[PDB]
From a paper:
In humans, the uniporter functions as a holocomplex (referred to as uniplex henceforth) and consists of the pore-forming subunit MCU, an essential membrane-spanning subunit EMRE, and the gate-keeping subunits MICU1 and MICU2. The two-transmembrane (2-TM) MCU component forms a tetrameric channel pore and the single-TM EMRE becomes an integral part of the channel by forming a 1:1 stoichiometric subcomplex with MCU and renders the channel conductive. MICU1 and MICU2 are two paralogous EF-hand containing proteins that are localized to the mitochondrial intermembrane space (IMS) and function as gate-keepers by sensing the cytosolic Ca2+ concentration and, thereby, regulate MCU-EMRE channel activity.
The MICU1-MICU2 tetramer is formed by the dimerization of two MICU1-MICU2 heterodimers through a back-to-back packing between MICU2 subunits, resulting in a linear arrangement of MICU1-MICU2-MICU2-MICU1. Each MICU1 subunit interacts with two EMRE subunits that are proximal to the central axis of the uniplex dimer by forming putative salt-bridge networks. Firstly, the α1 helix of MICU1 is oriented parallel to the membrane surface with its N-terminus pointing toward the C-terminal end of the transmembrane helix of EMRE. This configuration would lead to the convergence of the KKKKR poly-basic region that extends from the MICU1 α1 helix to the C-terminal poly-aspartate tail on EMRE. The second point of contact is mediated by the α11 helix of MICU1 and the poly-aspartate tail of the other EMRE subunit. The MICU1 α11 helix contains multiple basic residues whose side chains point directly toward the EMRE loop and likely form the second network of salt bridges with the poly-aspartate tail of EMRE. The binding of the MICU1-MICU2 tetramer does not block the channel pore of MCU, nor does it introduce any visible conformational change to each MCU-EMRE subcomplex, whose structure is virtually identical to that determined previously without bound MICU1 and MICU2.
Numbering used by the authors:
A (entry chain S): 108 to 135, 145 to 158, 193 to 252, 276 to 443
B (entry chain T): 85 to 118, 122 to 208, 230 to 399
């Protein structure tokens, strides 16, 4: 039944999020905590409760949680806080949320007895737990070979994150198994560092544009230095080797902007 | 094709290698197209770039030099990247230029930039500014940060005195005409209808207002967060929430005449709301340099 599988991709990638909402919502309009996963894929569920995604804006909010770098995240905490005391209770988030739409997670993460005393660090932990659980679920959909996904699986994860229907890269994807006749696998930490790096490309785009308006020849040591600099993550050479083998379309050895970085940035925009 | 603008505003050269003045650098910042390239041997190089410590290291440094400066194409692109860089990437670019990890940039970093230039295929001003005559002096982060902000602030001042026409103040017509510099002509003329009709006298626009506004326009993508929030929520942004968003973005309050004049500009319909789409699109057209 591929005709529904491919049909869901265009709506989940391009339509308005209420059209994505009512297509996966059954309670009526409400989703479950598990309708959200089908809405984002073609335990923290026990914490979400049943009062979730009332007016498809908890969808928007947790989408923002999935799509926000850290310097964009602390300033989101700034724009939550009205008086600027450094705390955001559930009441201030209710006041913001009424403006957004114009509570089972508010009872979970802010306070039990309508008592929200929220530091920056808890708000950081929220994003880290949520995104790491989503990244673990995506790592385990592809059934890792004892915690080691294959090369075509990781390439499919990268293409699913890029969101661009490139038939050229689709052709490269099934060639990836043929290029590297041996594949040792891709561990969860190699994924965990590299998507952390991919989260922050628009910050990485600073030194990349510094490089770029001179020349467009991206090597592995520069990317690893900026990864360990900005994201403080380590990229193994197998990972950059897979990235070079997948995305270097002209095969000149080193990547340009419009091969990889411009497309990933455009994904970060929309 | 950024080499071709360096071909344009070159005015002195050495051994086939085109150079510029600091004045040609400032014209490459602002002016579109205008000179005659003349040749320089080593004695000319010494007589031009001698006495760099005579220039004051404040915010008038290229105006302190005038023509006294020769800029390589590497330094040309380096300073253009400084002009395009937001405030946040400062220490990041410093540590990316800290390959040896010694809390410093050294002369081998500039030679590695020239290695990049060579793979894409002579003592200059910034070499004396940051490393002395032969590179023996060092370069830390504080001088680097102060140099970047002084460069950007002096560009702000030079554009301010251009569009203010020598005054210490601006009118709202000058602010609108500067602000709508890289706009397409049809939307520009609809904005000029908005200037002729909806803009009023107001008052004079000072220097620190323009400085804070340029500091706003270097943080547009981080400003775009609440924009896309109330865009996908389809809340048309009013001026009061816009005050809060600008204060959270920049960390500094704009004055109310700035916000009033901007709201008179970007409200085409007059419907007391914000068309943020054309706003951000022509704004990202507007704040792109190299042109």
């Amino acid at each position: 039944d591929r005709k529904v599988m491919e049909y869901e991709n265009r709506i989940r990638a391009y339509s308005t999020p209420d059209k994505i909402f009512r297509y996966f919502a059954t309670l009526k309009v409400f989703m479950t905590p598990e309708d959200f996963v089908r809405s984002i894929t073609p335990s923290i569920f026990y914490t979400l409760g049943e009062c979730g995604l009332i007016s498809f804006s908890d969808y928007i909010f947790l989408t923002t949680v999935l799509s926000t770098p850290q310097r964009n995240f602390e300033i989101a905490f700034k724009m939550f806080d009205l008086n600027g005391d450094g705390e955001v209770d559930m009441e201030e988030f209710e006041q913001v949320q009424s403006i957004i739409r114009s509570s089972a997670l508010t009872t979970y993460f802010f306070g039990a007895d309508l008592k929200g005393k929220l530091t920056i660090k808890n708000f950081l932990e929220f994003q880290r737990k949520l995104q790491h659980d989503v990244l673990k679920l995506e790592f385990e959909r592809h059934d890792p070979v004892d915690g080691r996904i294959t090369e075509r699986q990781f390439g499919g994860m990268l293409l699913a994150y890029s969101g661009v229907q490139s038939k050229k890269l689709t052709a490269m994807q099934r060639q990836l198994k043929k290029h590297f006749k041996e594949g040792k696998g891709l561990t969860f930490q190699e994924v965990e560092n590299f998507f952390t790096f991919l989260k922050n490309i628009n910050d990485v785009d600073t030194a990349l544009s510094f490089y770029h308006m001179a020349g467009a020849s991206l090597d592995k040591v520069t990317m690893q230095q900026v990864a360990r600099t900005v994201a403080k993550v380590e990229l193994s050479d197998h990972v950059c080797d897979v990235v070079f083998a997948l995305f270097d379309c002209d095969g000149n050895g080193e990547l340009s902007n419009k091969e990889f970085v411009s497309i990933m940035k455009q994904r970060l925009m929309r | 094709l950024r080499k071709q603008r360096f071909m344009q505003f070159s005015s002195l050269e050495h051994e086939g290698e085109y150079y510029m003045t600091p004045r040609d650098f400032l014209f490459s910042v602002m002016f579109e197209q205008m000179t005659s390239v003349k040749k320089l041997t080593k004695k000319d190089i010494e007589d031009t770039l001698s006495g760099i410590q005579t220039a004051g290291c404040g915010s008038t440094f290229f105006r302190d030099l005038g023509d006294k400066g020769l800029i390589s194409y590497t330094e040309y692109l380096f300073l253009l990247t400084i002009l395009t860089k937001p405030h946040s990437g400062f220490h990041v670019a410093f540590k990316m230029l800290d390959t040896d990890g010694n809390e410093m940039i050294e002369k081998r970093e500039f030679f590695k930039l020239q290695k990049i230039i060579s793979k894409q295929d002579i003592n200059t001003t910034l070499q004396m500014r940051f490393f002395g005559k032969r590179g023996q002096r060092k370069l830390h982060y504080k001088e680097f940060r102060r140099f970047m902000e002084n460069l950007q602030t002096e560009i702000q001042e030079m554009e301010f005195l251009q569009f203010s026409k020598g005054l210490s103040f601006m009118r709202k017509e000058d602010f609108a005409e500067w602000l709508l510099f890289f706009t397409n002509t049809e939307n520009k003329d609809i904005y000029w209808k908005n200037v002729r009709e909806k803009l009023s006298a107001g008052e004079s626009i000072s220097l620190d207002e323009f400085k804070s506004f340029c500091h706003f326009t270097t943080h547009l993508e981080d400003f775009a967060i609440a924009m896309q929030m109330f865009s996908l929520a389809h809340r048309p942004v009013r001026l009061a929430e816009f005050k809060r968003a600008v204060k959270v973005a920049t960390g500094q309050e704009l004055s109310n005449n700035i916000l009033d004049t901007v709201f008179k500009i970007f409200d085409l319909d007059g419907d007391e709301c914000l068309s943020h789409e054309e706003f951000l699109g022509v704004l990202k057209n507007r704040m792109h340099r190299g042109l």
